[PDB]
Design a protein around this ligand. Sequence first.
Ligand code: 30E
Ligand code: CL
Ligand code: CL
Ligand code: CL
Ligand code: CL
Ligand code: CL
Ligand code: CL
Length: 246
Amino acid sequence: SRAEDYEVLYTIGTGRCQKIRRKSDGKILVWKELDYGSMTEAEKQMLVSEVNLLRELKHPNIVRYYDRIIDRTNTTLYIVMEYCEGGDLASVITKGTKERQYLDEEFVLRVMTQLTLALKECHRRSRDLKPANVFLDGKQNVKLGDFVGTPYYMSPEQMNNEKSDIWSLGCLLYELCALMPPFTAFSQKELAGKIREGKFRRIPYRYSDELNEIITRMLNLKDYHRPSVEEILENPLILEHHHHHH
Ligand SMILES: CC[C@H]1CN(c2nc(-c3cc(OC)c(OC)c(OC)c3)cnc2N)CC[C@H]1C(=O)O
Ligand SMILES: [Cl-]
Ligand SMILES: [Cl-]
Ligand SMILES: [Cl-]
Ligand SMILES: [Cl-]
Ligand SMILES: [Cl-]
Ligand SMILES: [Cl-]
């Protein structure tokens, strides 16, 4: 695997994320460009570990890693992976916010189902749940990727556990429905205050009582009252078509 095996089409974001084309079969992919020139041997060893871990993750709802390419000349490491043509959930939400248009319940259910399964897989093996780390492919599939900011999704436990991940999922699904997170504040201390009270607005009325109910359960103050991944997926809301399809 050499860089010359691929051709950069253009830069998606900025190290650098680029949409690329594999020359042999024309397959569309992306790579993440990492300049390791300024790294110590220690940090490079830490980098080697991380990349090996990504190679082991095979799941329909986790962004698929394909390859790693070393360019010793430019001291650049390339991580090759699947392309998610639908971009990230952050952009979907800001888009709904600016166009004043709520997302379909069907879409929210797809995200709930598919991220819950990604989470289930993560818990098996041993990756923050936030809109910017959730990607959409071209087939309605949902995939989990990998100081200044306010920690909107921090659970009550953390500010003091797999149920903690359930809280964060609740926050993400809440924000998808309401187009704002369940707890907002100008500082972290004000934020922490709101989280401890555990009160928030119901998601918009266009969304079913059943969907409101499960999101609300995920946001319970007590970790042990939050549903497990198993209890989530048992929900009558969740159907075959909400799962991944090739
Ligand atoms: C490469 C590192 C990242 C991001 N990543 C992928 N991102 C995109 C992607 C596509 C977009 O529009 C077509 C887009 O604009 C909204 C965008 O915004 C951030 C991202 C497509 N495919 C990807 N594989 C993969 C996961 C992730 C990581 O760090 O592991
Ligand atoms: Cl899939
Ligand atoms: Cl609105
Ligand atoms: Cl709807
Ligand atoms: Cl309450
Ligand atoms: Cl409301
Ligand atoms: Cl669980």
